[PDB]
Design a protein around this ligand. Sequence first.
Ligand SMILES: CC1=C(CCOP(=O)(O)OP(=O)(O)O)S[C@H]([C@](O)(CCC(=O)O)P(=O)(O)O)N1Cc1cnc(C)nc1N
Ligand SMILES: CC1=C(CCOP(=O)(O)OP(=O)(O)O)S[C@H]([C@](O)(CCC(=O)O)P(=O)(O)O)N1Cc1cnc(C)nc1N
Ligand SMILES: [Mg+2]
Ligand SMILES: [Mg+2]
Ligand SMILES: [Mg+2]
Ligand SMILES: [Mg+2]
Lengths: 855, 847
Amino acid sequence: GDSIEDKNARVIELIAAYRNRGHLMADIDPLRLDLDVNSHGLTLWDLDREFKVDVQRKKLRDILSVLRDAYCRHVGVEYTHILEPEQQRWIQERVETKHDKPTVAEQKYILSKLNAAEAFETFLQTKYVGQKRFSLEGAETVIPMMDAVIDQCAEHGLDEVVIAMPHRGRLNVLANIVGKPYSQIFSEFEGNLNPSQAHGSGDVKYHLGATGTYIQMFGDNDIEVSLTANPSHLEAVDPVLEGLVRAKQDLLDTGEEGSDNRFSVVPLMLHGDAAFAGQGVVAETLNLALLRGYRTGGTIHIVVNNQIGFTTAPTDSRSSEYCTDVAKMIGAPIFHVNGDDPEACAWVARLAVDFRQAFKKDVVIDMLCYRRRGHNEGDDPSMTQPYMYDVIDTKRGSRKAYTEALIGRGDISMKEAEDALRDYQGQLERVFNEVRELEKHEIEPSESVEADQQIPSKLATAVDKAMLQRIGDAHLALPEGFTVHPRVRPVLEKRREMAYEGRIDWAFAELLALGSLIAEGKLVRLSGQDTQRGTFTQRHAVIVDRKTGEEFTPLQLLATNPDGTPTGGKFLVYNSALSEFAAVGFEYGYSVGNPDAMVLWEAQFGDFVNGAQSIIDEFISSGEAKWGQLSDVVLLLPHGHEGQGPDHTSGRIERFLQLWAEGSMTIAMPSTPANYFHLLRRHGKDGIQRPLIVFTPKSMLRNKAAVSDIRDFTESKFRSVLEEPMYTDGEGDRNKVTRLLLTSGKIYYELAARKAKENREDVAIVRIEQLAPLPRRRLAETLDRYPNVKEKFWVQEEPANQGAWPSFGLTLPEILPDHFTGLKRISRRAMSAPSSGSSKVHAVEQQEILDTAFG
Amino acid sequence: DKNARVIELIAAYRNRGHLMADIDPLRLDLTLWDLDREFKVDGFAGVQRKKLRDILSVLRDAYCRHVGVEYTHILEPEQQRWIQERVETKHDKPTVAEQKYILSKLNAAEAFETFLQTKYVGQKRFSLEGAETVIPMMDAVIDQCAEHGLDEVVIAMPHRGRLNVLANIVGKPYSQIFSEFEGNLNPSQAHGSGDVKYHLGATGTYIQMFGDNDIEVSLTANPSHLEAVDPVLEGLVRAKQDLLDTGEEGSDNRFSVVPLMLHGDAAFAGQGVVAETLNLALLRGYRTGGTIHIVVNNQIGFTTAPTDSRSSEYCTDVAKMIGAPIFHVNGDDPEACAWVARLAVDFRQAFKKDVVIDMLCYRRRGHNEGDDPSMTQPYMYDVIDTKRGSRKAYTEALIGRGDISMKEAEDALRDYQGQLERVFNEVRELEKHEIEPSESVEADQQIPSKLATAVDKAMLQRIGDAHLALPEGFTVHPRVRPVLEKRREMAYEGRIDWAFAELLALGSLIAEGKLVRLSGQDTQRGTFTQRHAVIVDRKTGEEFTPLQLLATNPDGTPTGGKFLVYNSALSEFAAVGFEYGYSVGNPDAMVLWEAQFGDFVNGAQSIIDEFISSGEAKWGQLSDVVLLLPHGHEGQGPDHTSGRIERFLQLWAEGSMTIAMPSTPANYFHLLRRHGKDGIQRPLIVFTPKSMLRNKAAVSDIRDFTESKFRSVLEEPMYTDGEGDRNKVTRLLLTSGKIYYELAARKAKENREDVAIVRIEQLAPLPRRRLAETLDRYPNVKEKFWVQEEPANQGAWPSFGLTLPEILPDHFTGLKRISRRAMSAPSSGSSKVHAVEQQEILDTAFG
Ligand SMILES: CC1=C(CCOP(=O)(O)OP(=O)(O)O)S[C@H]([C@](O)(CCC(=O)O)P(=O)(O)O)N1Cc1cnc(C)nc1N
Ligand SMILES: CC1=C(CCOP(=O)(O)OP(=O)(O)O)S[C@H]([C@](O)(CCC(=O)O)P(=O)(O)O)N1Cc1cnc(C)nc1N
Ligand SMILES: [Mg+2]
Ligand SMILES: [Mg+2]
Ligand SMILES: [Mg+2]
Ligand SMILES: [Mg+2]
């Protein structure tokens, strides 16, 4: 036969090999630190021969030049893992082509960005040699790359770019991308902060955020750009950024629940190479990318891959070939780019935005670069990486290299390049001198943020009977032909009955609170594991057609007024992924993104919220004091000793009470459905942006004593302290009381049952519903109504080192000494775990507490 | 031409055939003239010429029937070829005896579940019904490991089929499982606070049914927190491999202890610890030679559908990042499940890397046996109601093939059921005894009386001299050489600093024959450039570890000891879990994990809460892991200041952990030596210094190492050795850590003979007797203050403010706090604000 047919088969194999694996041979590293193949008779003598390619006939040397330029030069493209052939074709069409050369104006603009990037760092090195700044030197190309992402987003007519990033080049991005004034950055290095800057306890300069407007230089558009605050904990901000962006998209009616699919707010997420591979929150957050409750239409990721993590080499940081391999699980294309090629970096940035816009999905840019100085500017890296730093010492920086290229191209002269550098440096010097001339402020200890936010003087949470009845009737306003599951129908009928006749249970009180807020025009977002039905089969926020699987959400009917006009409200209820860290981070971010939303996250059991401990510690409990960032997220934590074991008993009340300070959070453990209703309505209507932690029930959901009357919803308010109904409404005599039992939560019902069984008129039980801030005035005023009390006990089912005792045992005798001197504890013994593993052992221990309280 | 269509068609089946494979038991979701034409293909024994008809039948059987194979993401062509050779050829047909054995495992699997359903209808058991093939699959993994002559299989798994695996794979007695359902436990079963039945572990010996080998099989305990045990399993296996001299640090590369890790579908996709643990798989400090993963993929997670649980096509897509092949297999085909299990073991043995089996199955009952799944999944449960189980279908096949008769099949099933009934009746006949409250485990482990931790001068000198015993031609970095010279000087002359005291402790243990494993972020050099446990040749990059020289006696014989020091990945959850597991796996090892700053250990909160602080009380599982947490107010911000002492003190109970904040290098040395030599297996939490590493006052004398012991309470040297008068003291300041040096400097500056400073070095268990004895030496004290740099809601005050007046009322009634105000964060963000607040504490203490 004709050997051209054999040779053509080898050409088809070569095309596939470059597309699939060319990235493994690409010249992406700026440091350059690192017989049985069947050729089917193809050799170097076939270079000028024409071959058939899939339609077209091309010379072998031309096929090989296109493949080598696309896949083996300064850009490594990974895309053949993508399922969708139209996405692979889209990328092939754009990378297997001769690129348009940037104009001289575009080249000068890129150089102006590299000048700003390096000169900002060398200026800080000269003025503040002894202060950490986490310089981007060796990775200056991140600045024209980020400029190109934002400029391309503006070109697509998008609304906003929200950035989250770590420390590397943070100050550089704040000054040269977001527009944080140089004077403000210099004031931080000077330690001369005005009262606004010195507010709260604060945080380090490389954790701060900023906002501004980016104005295009090559087009007629502009776009908002924001950079969010973050703690030191690397990658922890990743789900927070997604939540912030989702909330902004929902507000613009763009995105998943929106009237259009523009997803017009773009998350731009930066990462370090060691952190991106090592932190589990990265995979958890990528896992949210296509979920209906969390999708943001694609995140643009940039890894500042300086091939080091402090003193650790990549071989000790990851098991994958690339630090970006984790992102392939959601079908993201990956572009590995040589950080010493500014034009390739800008081109990849624009291609990434175009791909995100075309397919509304994630894209990753792996920018290979290096770290010019030590990990921080006081660290000596040659002790552990002598070879790498001997190579770095021989390298001209990307600014100098690009300047020489433009001089060589004839664009600029050496004198012009020198003058432009002196001008930028001269402007930094001028601003530095002005800041240094400012009057020095006296340094004072930091102050509590407690008084910065206060409840309005007038706020009622009660609703009328018509509102209760409307929410009850919504449960039976089924779509025509809908088949209700036979074991769900009694719940719907019971809700109509409770709305008109009382005995309202916990689950319905929660829906009365959320439904009445929706009717008043509020956006309510509720999510968590199995939250649509409820872990305890109690919520039924979504009901499923038994014959068709169609879904009906009764509370969504409250988003329309009886006359047919919208209230402006909405109910967004989702089953979350099986994640705690990313889910809690996302809801925290969502509440920051839309302060007017009611945002609730529900743990399956409170025992699993320790999986989100970094979010609780670094964002929820402390973001207001550290950054002035406000969140109104609600965490619902099912809690209570019921004999189900040490991981189905406790939400670790003691840990939240320990974290509490400065009125940063509200912490509550309501004992009645109406009090929970009023708590949620107060939180949604008070205009205070502070988190709420609620310890919620499990067996108490179906306790026939734990029900509320209609008048408790229509004629009452949130009560931080509750007395027994016999004293406030009944014929109970407070003067007969000699023993006071103080408690919180479901144990009240067991104590009250024991009091009734033994007719103990000498014992009274007082509940603390709001654990933090402690209701000092209401507690003192309640205790003053029992003048003959000789002894007081704090009673709890939790072990002695858990529950409220560790904080209350110390604080109650200090803040109210005339009431709580001599306060004693009644509880389970101190325990390493939250409870026994045995239901029978739980029952004996529970009875001991009750016997001790009445002994 | 037509051959061009064939080569691309072969690639299409290999790359994407899995997308069309018949893997779901529920089924809820160029020309025809070329068939007899011969084409050239790359056969497994050389180039072959095959009819297109035969190429297509092989590809459809390999990739589109009950097994979906994902492997073309793997970099190594030899691994793809290995898989092709085994999937694109005829599979070995099981013998009739092997088929009957698989059926006996399905019988045991289903009959155990239906028996518990009959006897204990109201108790959760997380049944494997709908996924019974996991039992012959696990049997096949373990049998294939025994066929390779491996030493042990260690299993970690969640709740799904846990009781079934304990009884039918590991050999936990049926009588013990029934006693758990009965709630009639003997005193050993009732020991500690305990845990739920589907969290418990067991160990036994597996004996091959057809071969001549045995193998050890163990299943580790775990909390409810799904996937949290994954890094613990890897640590336990690595410790066992290091002991057998197999694996990464071993003389052979057998990696002869196999991790077998089971997962649920929703948890495997959702929990970040999965990716963190996979990321450890090829790292020198953590590699275990490949984990075999089995996902029990029942296409549901409680009430949540897969479309709400993950963004990837498969729940296993995360594992592709470490190049693991993935085998998706139809759970209703027991022979395909066993065949994939054996293939996975063979692949793990050939390439010493991870393999994933995604077993597609269903969940016969609700999430738990009291839950109604048709409320949320009506369609799925209408389909499940029409399905014959895998046991019934496999029995019908064997009866149909003529392997067994219906009478033989029923007799075998009734024999197993009769034996369950007999054991159940025997357990039910036992008298029920009084149920008592659970008891503290504190007294279970006690320190031997007068444990000596001092070493002689020769030992100190040997460790100092080891720092300059450089290999021939080694070039020391010019800024590292002064540290080595200073260590030799300190070993002979004193003024021993914190960093060298740590290495004196570890070095002296290695010399005594102990394995010491030390790891953490940048731990080889040290975050504060203080450790230099490994030094790097300035010219060649070669590494030298001075403490490794202590593993050889001066006469040249080995001590039996070793120093394993690693830079960890940038992980806290998987790294802490791994070190906890390692300490469980080798109780004789000294295992230390170091946080870069203590502020980041909250990333491992699930491991601290669920394993470290509570595993002894819950499961009787003992760990001696050490956590080193750099801590101290130095003006570096709220994430570079605190290891959250207050949280560890709150978690503390029952003597479960030792918690310490030493103020001197010798006291830290004695703390580490006591921990390594006391024969007690309980974790140690140490709050370690940063600036105090280089404080010239924070140095120790040679006599502090050779003639002393760990001191839980320390007085000022002026009273124990100097000319200080204790009777002049009217104000006592109690403290812990570096603030002691600032308080002592202020006392010396103002000649405050009326003030004494007492340090509590061991925070938990509180040294009640030594504290009382010390305070009794100051008879004229009129006021006592607890002084700390931490905010009032942090540090030791929240626990000590409550416990000291209760446990020592004649000494601490009236105890007052001196500290920073209560704060939402651990500190101010400003170094200047920190400095003003620090001076306020010092001024208040002496005001
Ligand atoms: C381990 C670690 C760093 C190395 C990161 O390497 P890579 O991701 O490649 O980024 P790059 O630095 O190469 O660009 S910087 C950071 C630290 O905390 C600085 C960051 C910060 O505090 O904000 P440090 O004070 O310990 O140095 N640090 C401690 C650390 C540990 N664990 C977590 C979860 N977060 C952290 N901040
Ligand atoms: C969300 C959740 C479960 C669903 C798992 O689905 P999948 O991974 O597909 O497994 P399978 O059940 O389909 O086989 S079972 C488990 C729970 O905790 C039971 C497990 C246990 O407690 O040990 P529960 O009491 O809330 O039901 N539970 C709560 C839970 C939440 N978050 C974590 C980290 N761990 C958990 N145990
Ligand atoms: Mg890096
Ligand atoms: Mg509010
Ligand atoms: Mg499942
Ligand atoms: Mg020990």
